[PDB]
RNA sequence: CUCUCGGCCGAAGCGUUUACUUUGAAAAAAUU
RNA sequence: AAACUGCGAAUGGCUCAUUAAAUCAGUUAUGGUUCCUUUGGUCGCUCGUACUUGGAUAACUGUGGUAAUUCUAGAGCUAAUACAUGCCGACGGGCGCUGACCCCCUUCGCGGGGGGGAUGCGUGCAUUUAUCAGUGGUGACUCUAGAUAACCUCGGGCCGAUCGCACGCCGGCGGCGACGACCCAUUCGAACGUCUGCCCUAUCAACUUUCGAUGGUAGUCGCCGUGCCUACCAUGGUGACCACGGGUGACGGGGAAUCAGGGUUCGAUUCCGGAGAGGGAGCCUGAGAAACGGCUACCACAUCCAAGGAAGGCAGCAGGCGCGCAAAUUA
């Protein structure tokens, strides 16, 4: 290429969007924004493919341009806007509030939230830096730079912030015995307690996470998101509690539901 | 906005120096 | 044009590399500004990402620092005396980074007069102006004259620097790159640097 | 002594060695303070880096070079060019059809700091990846362990 | 005064060129006798010189000072000026009006 | 396998280094 | 409508000629660089006509030239978030140097110690250099932040002379939004590196270095690291574990055919990466191209000529010729 790419093919799109193979040649290329395009839902897929509120992309444009959709309390008219993890989407016309939270199988589950939960959000802080005449700044996972934070907040901690002010309400420290969720890799979408973190200087440090049913797994620091203090989460969880079931248990639950509901 | 936020963090930093002073106190004293 | 690429080079093993794509825009090189000494001429060039790079073509004045007393002044550049890269570039009298250059001594000397009240570079004839006599022999109060006495306790200058002040020119080293910053700034040479460069100049002649 | 061998002046850029001083200090000792760096992966800084008088900008202890990326090892084969050496890394490459291996080698030019002196041929060296330093040199000697037979 | 013209093949003449015939000039934005189709393109075009020769076709020529006999097609004809001033400063200058 | 710092345990060195073997996390979708 | 201004036209599409550690794949680094846009931070933090600055230029009117072009010349006007120029407030001060002097303590006293201060100089963030001490962080900074002395390019750095919608309250204040903006971070990237991996050939066994080959020192250039280039030095560097040279009816992978197991062969071809627009070469604009549905040359072709000149680039979609054993509609 001679410059940045502007298109995206459906088969080269991320698989968690669950796009078809014969609808088109092109997938929605997400605009640049607070989330990576590999790790986001564009608003067209959420409004059209998930919620079924629109049948075509023209109807998505027609809904967004009438100023009904808010992301983190801000009206967005870009239909390919990158919406990511812990993300609050408010539709005030229908009176609906959703959070984008990862599903157990690695996809973005649409999790309807009670409206007073839609006032805050959780952010994983990416870096700390002191600049411009001794003022400290946080940078979080969704690129919200917050100046003058609490001095006890370090990197890999999480913060609960109010969406109307953008200012920190209260934070969770990254430590063992805390509740977290996986945002990347093979174990994506699983919720469990941090057992220990092993250090590998000059490389990736590995975290071990134990499930509520005694299932242990591991990831990297780049794929951990602390969501609770201790065991109680600071957010509402999806219909599955983040427990990965094997295919045998999924089959057994499916046959049980078939037997119960006929 | 800068004046009030800087004054609030100035209160926070004077606080953080106060508890830093006391933590230094039981660390040195013991 | 001038292409500063790697693929035109021979390999480590000594085999010729067969080229596979033509010259690219990010591989370019531009002609050197042989920055001479004269009344100031600086041209700007647009560079990668839309930024500017000051291509100073001739310079006369530079901001140099005498670091033992932590003084920094503008000084007119007199003459290049030594370069470690090539001899011939002194024939063309070009300012580059890390070249040894004679500059004037007036502002550092004037600061020395105002700060310590000791003469520098005055001959045995002791020629003086009323302004210089009013600066050197300034009327003092008690606190000021005590501060000047305590300052006079520390006033020592190396003998080679004294010879430089007597000749009126201090030799220094340019620390910036005038070709792609636009300014010729540096530091006054002292100590082992100073005698090292002096014996290099004496060894050249 | 025998440091100023090039046409320019050799100097550690961080250390300000031309501080003016009292004549008693001039009479006492003309000693230059030394800049050294603690390097990351548990590598100990040798005493020759901290006490020696050599100057080079490509030393991983007293220079501008920072070590990041890969850490490998090799055997010293050639020490003939100036302040860099040629080491050899040997391995077995697997061939799947015959289910066997073949012996392969690669030579690397790696920078050797003057703090590692009396290095011989055929001893093991641990090197760490850094930025390019020349046309071929990409790694830098981190530590030297002598040969199996050499005392 | 001589203000321009075209030789027998129609090419205009530019102010800088001091030859007799045609020159090939690499012209860009801001130059006369050229209008660029894209931003920042140059084109090589034929340009006639300033020296008046026997090889001209039309001489564009602008009078500065009037004579006595009025020409029946140039001066006796009267034509107004359309579209007067729009900016407020131009309003004040063109009618010599005060600030108030 | 252990001497020091902190709450029976966590940090620090490991242990001559490997080859081998098992496990874990990284290995785009499409195709199989 | 037109035109000026801004953006995009660097994506997509086509093809597989070149290319043999090159491309590419997996793996890592940028603590060695740039980044339009989006998203968040910042924008009275500078002590030094504004209730609004200046000259034009299109479109339009009018007069023309050439055989010919998406050719343009001249003369009348007229705008700006085009092009330039340029404040006031915040603005009252504070902080360091410099200090006319003034005060206090000690001193018999000389003399010693401690305070207040008018006049002058500099002050914010970006840039360049030098020095000093060591808020937050890294596995490791010559990191970030701080303090001091200065600098700050006329081919010049930011410090809003811009538009819209509703209008409302104590002659003056104002609520949303759009275009802006130096610098941080984010997103999309890109570009240089790390380790390992490719077909045939010895009727290719030594190659590389005068013209950079391998390394050192200082510089130049570059967005940056580096023989990337220069100067001065040293004689190094690769190789039967197959260097070097030649060939390939060779773009590389994901993959495909066949197959008990092992294997053999294919992969121009819709996904990812690279390369190139007849062949080479050099540029302008721009955040991004050495761009070809951009420009300028030469080489080879080739179009219209009134013989002076002018205009080209289907390995885009259809289509045609040619080529062939071999491949579709000017919807």
């Amino acid at each position: 290429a001679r410059g940045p790419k502007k298109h995206l093919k459906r088969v080269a799109a991320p698989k968690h969007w669950m796009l078809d193979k014969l609808t088109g040649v092109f997938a929605p290329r997400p605009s640049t924004g607070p989330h990576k395009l590999r790790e986001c839902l564009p608003l067209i897929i959420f409004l059209r493919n998930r919620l079924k509120y629109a049948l075509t992309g023209d109807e998505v444009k027609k809904i967004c341009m009438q100023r009904f959709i808010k992301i983190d309390g801000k009206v967005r008219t870009d239909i390919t806007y990158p919406a990511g993890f812990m993300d609050v989407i408010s539709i005030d016309k229908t009176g609906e509030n959703f959070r984008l939270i990862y599903d157990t199988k690695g996809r973005f589950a649409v999790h309807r939230i009670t409206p007073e939960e839609a006032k805050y959000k959780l952010c994983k802080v990416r870096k700390i830096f002191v600049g411009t005449k001794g003022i400290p700044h946080l940078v979080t996972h969704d690129a919200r730079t917050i100046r003058y934070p609490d001095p006890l907040i370090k990197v890999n901690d999480t913060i609960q912030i109010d969406l109307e002010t953008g200012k920190i309400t209260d934070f969770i420290k990254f430590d063992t015995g805390n509740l977290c969720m996986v945002t990347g890799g093979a174990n994506l979408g699983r919720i469990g307690v941090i057992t220990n973190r092993e250090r590998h200087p000059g490389s990736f440090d590995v975290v071990h996470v134990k499930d509520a049913n005694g299932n242990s797994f591991a990831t990297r620091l780049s794929n951990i998101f602390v969501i609770g203090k201790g065991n109680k989460p600071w957010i509402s969880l999806p219909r599955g509690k983040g427990i990965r079931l094997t295919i045998a248990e999924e089959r057994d639950k499916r046959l049980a539901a078939k037997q119960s509901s006929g | 906005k800068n004046k009030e936020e800087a004054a609030e963090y100035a209160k926070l930093l004077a606080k953080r120096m106060k508890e830093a002073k006391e933590k230094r106190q039981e660390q040195i004293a013991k | 044009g001038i292409s500063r690429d790697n693929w035109h080079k021979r390999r480590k093993t000594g085999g010729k590399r067969k080229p596979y794509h033509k010259k690219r825009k990010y591989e370019l090189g531009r002609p050197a500004a042989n920055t001479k000494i004269g009344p100031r001429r600086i041209h700007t060039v647009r560079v990668r990402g839309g930024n500017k790079k000051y291509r100073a073509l001739r310079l006369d004045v530079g901001n140099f620092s005498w670091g033992s007393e932590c003084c920094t002044r503008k000084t007119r550049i007199i003459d290049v005396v030594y370069n470690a890269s090539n001899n011939e570039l002194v024939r063309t009298k070009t300012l580059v980074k890390n070249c040894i250059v004679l500059i004037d001594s007036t502002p550092y000397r004037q600061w020395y007069e105002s700060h310590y009240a000791l003469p520098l570079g005055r001959k045995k004839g002791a020629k003086l102006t009323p302004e210089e006599e009013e600066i050197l022999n300034k009327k003092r109060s008690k606190k000021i004259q005590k501060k000047y006495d305590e300052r006079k306790k520390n006033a020592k200058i190396s003998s080679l620097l004294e010879e430089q002040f007597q000749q009126g020119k201090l030799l220094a080293c340019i620390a910036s790159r005038p070709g792609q910053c636009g300014r010729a700034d540096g530091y006054v040479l002292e100590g082992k640097e100073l005698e090292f460069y002096l014996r290099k100049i004496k060894a050249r002649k | 002594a025998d440091i100023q061998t090039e046409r320019a002046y050799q100097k550690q850029p961080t250390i300000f060695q031309n501080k003016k001083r009292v004549l008693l200090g001039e009479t006492g000792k003309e000693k230059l303070p030394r800049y050294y760096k603690n390097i990351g992966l548990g590598f100990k800084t040798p005493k020759e880096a901290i006490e020696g008088t050599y100057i080079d900008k490509k030393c991983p202890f007293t220079g501008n070079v920072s070590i990041r990326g890969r850490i490998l090892s090799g055997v010293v084969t050639k020490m003939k060019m100036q302040r860099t050496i040629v080491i050899r890394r040997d391995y077995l490459h697997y061939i799947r059809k015959y289910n066997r291996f073949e012996k392969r080698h690669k030579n690397m030019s790696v920078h050797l700091s003057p703090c590692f002196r009396d290095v011989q041929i055929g001893d093991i060296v641990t090197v760490g990846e850094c930025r390019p330093l020349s046309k071929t040199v990409r790694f830098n000697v981190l530590k030297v362990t002598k040969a199996a037979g050499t005392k | 005064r001589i203000s321009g013209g075209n030789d027998k093949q129609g090419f205009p003449m530019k102010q800088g060129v001091l030859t007799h015939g045609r020159v090939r000039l690499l012209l860009s934005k801001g130059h006369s006798c050229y209008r660029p189709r894209r931003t920042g393109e140059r084109k090589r075009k034929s340009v006639r010189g300033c020296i008046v020769d026997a090889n001209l076709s039309v001489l564009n020529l602008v009078i500065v000072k009037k004579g006595e006999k009025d020409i029946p097609g140039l001066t006796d004809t009267t034509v107004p000026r359309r579209l007067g001033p729009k900016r407020a400063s131009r309003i004040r200058k063109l009618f010599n009006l005060s600030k108030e």
Side-chain angles (χ1 to χ4, degrees), chain C residues 110 113-114 117 130-138 140:
Chain C
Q110 186 201 345
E113 296 293 328
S114 66
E131 291 87 24
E132 281 290 315
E133 287 177 299
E134 280 185 57
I135 292 158
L136 178 63
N137 296 114
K138 196 173 177 68
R140 296 269 80 91

Side-chain angles (χ1 to χ4, degrees), chain C residues 152-167:
Chain C
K152 275 183 174 183
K153 188 268 183 182
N154 303 311
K156 273 78 69 178
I157 301 299
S158 299
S159 298
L160 304 159
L161 281 164
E162 298 287 22
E163 180 68 49
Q164 292 301 299
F165 269 96
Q166 280 274 319
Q167 284 182 300

Side-chain angles (χ1 to χ4, degrees), chain D residues 67-92:
Chain D
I67 298 298
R68 76 283 185 276
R70 293 192 187 270
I71 294 93
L72 316 168
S73 299
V75 62
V76 173
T77 55
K78 282 188 282 289
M79 294 177 70
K80 291 182 183 293
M81 73 195 146
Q82 176 156 21
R83 203 166 268 177
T84 61
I85 54 164
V86 169
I87 65 153
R88 184 176 179 179
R89 304 174 74 247
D90 298 301
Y91 51 96
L92 299 163

Side-chain angles (χ1 to χ4, degrees), chain A residues 1-7 9 11-12 29 32-33 35-37 74 76 81 127-131 133-134 139 143-145 147 154 201-202 204 220:
Chain A
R2 273 180 278 141
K5 277 151 181 320
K6 302 179 184 182
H7 292 240
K9 303 291 176 68
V11 65
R29 171 90 178 187
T32 58
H35 304 275
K36 297 177 79 74
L37 63 84
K74 298 294 293 295
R76 296 277 177 253
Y81 184 80
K127 53 207 280 174
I128 306 297
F129 68 98
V130 182
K133 293 182 183 293
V139 190
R144 320 163 75 91
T145 62
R147 63 204 296 262
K154 298 294 154 184
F204 317 112
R220 290 176 181 171

Side-chain angles (χ1 to χ4, degrees), chain C residues 1 4 8-13 16-17 22-24 26 29-30 32 40 43-44 46 48-49 52-53 55 63 65 72 74 85-86 97-98 139-141 144 146 151 177 180 183:
Chain C
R4 57 193 311 276
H8 88 284
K9 297 297 290 292
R10 195 173 284 274
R11 277 169 199 151
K12 176 181 182 169
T13 69
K16 56 185 73 68
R17 191 193 298 266
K22 57 188 82 200
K23 297 182 185 179
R24 287 277 188 277
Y26 51 82
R30 292 193 193 92
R40 190 169 63 171
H43 297 167
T44 53
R46 186 194 174 280
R48 185 71 177 173
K52 292 194 289 184
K53 222 176 214 185
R55 191 69 38 94
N63 176 77
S65 57
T72 300
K74 287 176 70 176
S85 305
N86 44 357
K97 193 194 161 201
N98 198 233
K139 184 175 184 292
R140 296 269 80 91
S141 296
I144 313 154
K146 291 177 70 68
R151 283 187 188 173
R177 293 178 292 173
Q180 64 183 357
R183 318 186 217 151

Side-chain angles (χ1 to χ4, degrees), chain C:
Chain C
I2 300 168
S3 179
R4 57 193 311 276
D5 53 66
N6 178 52
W7 39 272
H8 88 284
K9 297 297 290 292
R10 195 173 284 274
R11 277 169 199 151
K12 176 181 182 169
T13 69
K16 56 185 73 68
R17 191 193 298 266
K18 181 68 174 66
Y20 75 114
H21 74 276
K22 57 188 82 200
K23 297 182 185 179
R24 287 277 188 277
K25 179 66 170 63
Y26 51 82
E27 294 162 351
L28 66 86
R30 292 193 193 92
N34 315 302
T35 312
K36 318 279 177 182
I37 293 194
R40 190 169 63 171
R41 179 193 308 240
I42 298 169
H43 297 167
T44 53
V45 65
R46 186 194 174 280
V47 291
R48 185 71 177 173
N51 309 115
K52 292 194 289 184
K53 222 176 214 185
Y54 301 87
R55 191 69 38 94
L57 290 170
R58 60 186 68 183
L59 292 167
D60 48 345
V61 177
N63 176 77
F64 294 88
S65 57
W66 185 49
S68 292
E69 291 82 2
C70 199
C71 182
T72 300
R73 296 291 185 269
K74 287 176 70 176
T75 316
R76 57 153 290 210
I77 303 197
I78 311 291
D79 203 34
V80 178
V81 294
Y82 177 81
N83 192 21
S85 305
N86 44 357
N87 190 1
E88 190 276 331
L89 184 63
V90 187
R91 284 145 191 51
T92 62
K93 293 182 183 293
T94 300
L95 300 169
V96 286
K97 193 194 161 201
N98 198 233
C99 70
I100 300 318
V101 61
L102 277 174
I103 65 170
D104 191 359
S105 66
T106 300
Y108 308 100
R109 184 177 179 179
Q110 186 201 345
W111 176 87
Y112 201 73
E113 296 293 328
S114 66
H115 194 97
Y116 290 111
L118 282 73
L120 282 180
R122 291 278 175 269
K123 289 196 86 71
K124 208 189 284 166
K127 52 179 73 65
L128 279 154
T129 54
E131 291 87 24
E132 281 290 315
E133 287 177 299
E134 280 185 57
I135 292 158
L136 178 63
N137 296 114
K138 196 173 177 68
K139 184 175 184 292
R140 296 269 80 91
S141 296
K142 64 90 176 179
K143 175 65 68 68
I144 313 154
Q145 69 90 28
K146 291 177 70 68
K147 293 187 286 185
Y148 266 87
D149 291 331
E150 294 293 328
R151 283 187 188 173
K152 275 183 174 183
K153 188 268 183 182
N154 303 311
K156 273 78 69 178
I157 301 299
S158 299
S159 298
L160 304 159
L161 281 164
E162 298 287 22
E163 180 68 49
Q164 292 301 299
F165 269 96
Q166 280 274 319
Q167 284 182 300
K169 280 73 176 175
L170 266 58
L171 54 87
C173 189
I174 298 172
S176 68
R177 293 178 292 173
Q180 64 183 357
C181 287
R183 318 186 217 151
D185 294 357
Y187 62 96
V188 189
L189 300 163
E190 292 178 352
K192 316 278 181 33
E193 291 179 352
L194 175 80
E195 40 258 33
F196 175 80
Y197 282 128
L198 291 173
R199 66 184 184 272
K200 294 293 183 182
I201 301 140
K202 296 183 290 294
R204 180 64 199 87
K205 291 172 275 178

